[PDB]
Amino acid sequence: MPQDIDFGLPAPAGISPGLEATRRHNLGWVRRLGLVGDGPSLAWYTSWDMPRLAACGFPHARGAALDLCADAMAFFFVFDDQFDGPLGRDPARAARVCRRLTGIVHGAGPGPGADACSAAFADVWARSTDGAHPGWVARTAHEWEYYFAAQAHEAINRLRGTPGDMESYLQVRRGIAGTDLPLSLGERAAGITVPAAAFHSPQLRIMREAAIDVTLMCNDVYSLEKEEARGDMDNLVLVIEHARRCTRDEAVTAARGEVARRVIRFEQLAREVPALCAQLGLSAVERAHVDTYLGVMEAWMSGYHAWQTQTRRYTGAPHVLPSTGPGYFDEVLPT
Numbered sequence: 001m002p003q004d005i006d007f008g009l010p011a012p013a014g015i016s017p018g019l020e021a022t023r024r025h026n027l028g029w030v031r032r033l034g035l036v037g038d039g040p041s042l043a044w045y046t047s048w049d050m051p052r053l054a055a056c057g058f059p060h061a062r063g064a065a066l067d068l069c070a071d072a073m074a075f076f077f078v079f080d081d082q083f084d085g086p087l088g089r090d091p092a093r094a095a096r097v098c099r100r101l102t103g104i105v106h107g108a109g110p111g112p113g114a115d116a117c118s119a120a121f122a123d124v125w126a127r128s129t130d131g132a133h134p135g136w137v138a139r140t141a142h143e144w145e146y147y148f149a150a151q152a153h154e155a156i157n158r159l160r161g162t163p164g165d166m167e168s169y170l171q172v173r174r175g176i177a178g179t180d181l182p183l184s185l186g187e188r189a190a191g192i193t194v195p196a197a198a199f200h201s202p203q204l205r206i207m208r209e210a211a212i213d214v215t216l217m218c219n220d221v222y223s224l225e226k227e228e229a230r231g232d233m234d235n236l237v238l239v240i241e242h243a244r245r246c247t248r249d250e251a252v253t254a255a256r257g258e259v260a261r262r263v264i265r266f267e268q269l270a271r272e273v274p275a276l277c278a279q280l281g282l283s284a285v286e287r288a289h290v291d292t293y294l295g296v297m298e299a300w301m302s303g304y305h306a307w308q309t310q311t312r313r314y315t316g317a318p319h320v321l322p323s324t325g326p327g328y329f330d331e332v333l334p335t
Ligand SMILES: C[N+](C)(C)[C@]12C[C@H]3C[C@H](C[C@H](C3)C1)C2
Pocket: 076, 077, 080, 176, 177, 178, 182, 215, 216, 219, 304
């Protein structure tokens, strides 16, 4: 059981003080945008506790920056679940819907009266880029493109009905998990700009990749029950079981080891970051932003796991949205 699985990550070093204020803003935001309705959808959304995910996952965010984190997560989760139904078995249709969203990334604003997912994403994206450094905008725009474009490949895999090999699983799963977007968001919400010289060091590139893998793999373990019965194939536990011809328990144990090896690698490289900044001759302010970036990555890993142990999303989904029907109460994404 997930209640008996722990990945060795520390508890969150801090929780953003803006949790309760953001809870109020974000509840109004999802309702105003039409992303979440009234009744079952609202009770189901509330049970996820998106504000606590934002406050635990992004403890550096304050005020309106935490609101952006919660709203961004709300979009990610509501959009994700729209594919838990016929859309997720229709790759060509999924690719067309995701092309609509990708157009918003690259300038084509949806216009008045767009669907709730398009309108919500356009609002998150506009708030994200306002005052952001152009290097951040360019990188994050390509991250969003990968996220949207990957969804149809998860649908292809569902039709195939076998997990991919490890390399192909990582290519699809890193995309559908939102790639580096949670870290780009945390950087933006902390108000920092990572100097490119540090950002592209081998240490920080490996650490960034490791942190994103850690959260999606921790999710794969905790979300397997609601995913397996829907025919989902891009889950690390299923990938290992398929590749190794092992038992479920052996696959879960191996999945935990894949998380642990990445945590160990992250922390080994983190010890080199002060010296790296000195070799590059970064200014004191630049080193401060790098130090915050390190904490943003550490907090995303520990904060995501802290959230997923207390949310009702993973324990609740199989009972309120059984696999015999769609994984949502309301369609909000026109296809
Ligand atoms: C993109 N969604 C919302 C599915 C996730 C965002 C964050 C990173 C992945 C795992 C969970 C936390 C869920 C993906």
